[PDB]
Amino acid sequence: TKAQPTEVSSILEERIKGVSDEANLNETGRVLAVGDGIARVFGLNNIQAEELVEFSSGVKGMALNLEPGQVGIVLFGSDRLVKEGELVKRTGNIVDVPVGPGLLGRVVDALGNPIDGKGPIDAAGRSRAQVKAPGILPRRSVHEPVQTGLKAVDALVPIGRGQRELIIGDRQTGKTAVALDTILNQKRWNNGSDESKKLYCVYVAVGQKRSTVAQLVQTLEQHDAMKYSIIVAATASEAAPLQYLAPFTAASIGEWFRDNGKHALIVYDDLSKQAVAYRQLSLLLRRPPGREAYPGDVFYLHSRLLERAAKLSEKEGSGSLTALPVIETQGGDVSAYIPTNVISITDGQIFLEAELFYKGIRPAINVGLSVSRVGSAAQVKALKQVAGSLKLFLAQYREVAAFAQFGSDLDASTKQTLVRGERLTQLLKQNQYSPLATEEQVPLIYAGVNGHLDGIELSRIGEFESSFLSYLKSNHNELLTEIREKGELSKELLASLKSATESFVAT
């Protein structure tokens, strides 16, 4: 009967009569197969696990599956220079990245080498590609705000530091846009005072071609949101081991700021393509998969990665790496396997709807399918207070608006709710790639909740907004300042806000 290829009768008899174990099948092993940008070599009887084996072709590939038959080595290159009868020499060193404040304003691939000719990475340490999540002892409750250009998302869905919230939806539904609002408001804290309000944002782009990503960074350099951020890339044309390794080596670059007592935020785009890379990787190394052809341990990879963003104790500086996963569902397919796993990990949702994108809410905002499993207190205390009846009007509104479209009538009080729920809906709209500080997100939500958007008609929402911000700029700009710095409203502050709203209650 059939036995493994290293036990084959021609290779085995020569070994007995020449060299066999030790420095030829122990530090070395001789390739015997190769195709699909994937090879498998015989030997390597001693080797580290997840170690990097440099083939004598000028290719390096790490090995993740070991077999006493054929050790399955994933090449980071093409196979049109890798051959059968090459020797492979062990690096002896597990896959590692440069970490530094000299990855800033620079594009780098998963091997931490410049891919835009901005030259050398000045690195203050090196760190590890696979690193376990922090424990129970290095952990601190999260209460730190994060500014986003969309007011409803920041207020209801509490966007903290050291927490994972999943932005999910289809392509071209502004998957990209939600994240970019966050980045853009962080120009203001970056410039500004207080070290612990500072994100050195790390952008991860997996399965996105070279052309699309290069346009993007130029965009962030306009808005002065790139000259402190880090861009990690793993383009589609580059090999599947490389697409899989990009999120796990980006992690180390955020993890160093966290360590030093500074803070950062990691966008993991696309977690779905990592999973596609992983599928190719495991099925050409032969691992029986689960449903949909994605392997069994796909979830184990995704859970470990996401848990590299959490908040620490004051020993490690009060630091947090913060994560926002990004998941491209097939069609709003959230019952698919990979979306069900991510979902489990993440204690909030930044749910987007496709129909609403079309309706003119660009970028689309759905806080009725958004959830917050944990308590809310990692946003600006002030924006939460004003936006305190925002939940109740938007959720009551949905029911009366559904009913109204069947031709059954209702009492005047329900139509007061319904009417208000329309005035509010218009408020949300604002074009992609635009900032909106928190300081001017406390007035408008006060104004909406106290029926000051109920003094105007359905299309006079934009004209009211223009005058009110102008009024607050002359008289109550002190009011604006206290809101941002201290974030707490008192009767005095709320009374001034009231004068401001009454003054242009009409138009």
């Binding site: 009967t1 036995a3 036990e7 084959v8 009768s9 085995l12 008899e13 007995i16 009569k17």
Partner: protein, 187 residues
């Protein structure tokens, strides 16, 4: 330099054994000692339930090899390398399968052919030799590789004969012709 390598799984283990012993000679000696030890093991009743049916461990196999090297003169150490390959692969049951195929390769390199003149009854010694003379004469052997044709009794055939070797067959069996006669006369 395989004279005619076999693809089939363990027709390749035969190929491997051949090349190794062919470049260090002593293949006719090896095969001859090998055939003898295989016949004397199988007809010994200890390994007539245990190398006839492999049912021994890994460690218990090596100790079988150690008892085996008393049994014959090894004669070429590449057949001693075969014992190490099979004990490691944890069978001793496809030991004689490699040997049989190795034998064919060995006699083929020397330039000898082994064929069959299957019939349902044996013929005249005259009949056999004429058929041999004809095959060498005919333009299907150059007269470069020597001839053996072996008469056998198969029960399949109902009369007539088929000469077979090398995937050249000359078919004048009646067995098939009778069957077709019935069909066509029950049409």
């Amino acid at each position: 330099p395989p004279p005619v390598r076999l693809f089939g799984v363990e027709g390749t283990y035969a190929t491997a054994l051949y090349q190794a012993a062919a470049k260090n000679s002593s293949i006719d000696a090896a095969f001859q000692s090998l055939q003898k030890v295989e016949s004397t093991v199988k007809k010994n009743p200890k390994l007539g339930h245990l190398l006839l049916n492999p049912a021994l461990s890994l460690k218990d196999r090596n100790s079988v090899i150690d008892a085996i090297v008393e049994t014959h003169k090894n004669l070429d150490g590449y057949v001693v390398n075969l014992l190490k390959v099979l004990s490691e692969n944890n069978r001793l049951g496809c030991f004689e399968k490699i040997a049989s195929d190795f034998g064919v390769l060995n006699d083929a390199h020397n330039g000898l052919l082994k064929g069959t003149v299957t019939s349902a009854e044996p013929l005249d010694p005259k009949s056999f030799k004429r058929i041999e003379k004809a095959l060498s004469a005919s333009k299907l052997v150059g007269q470069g590789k020597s001839l053996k044709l072996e008469n056998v009794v198969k029960p399949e055939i109902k009369g007539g004969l088929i000469v077979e070797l090398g995937d050249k067959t000359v078919d004048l069996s009646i067995s098939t012709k009778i069957q077709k006669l019935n069909k066509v006369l029950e049409d």
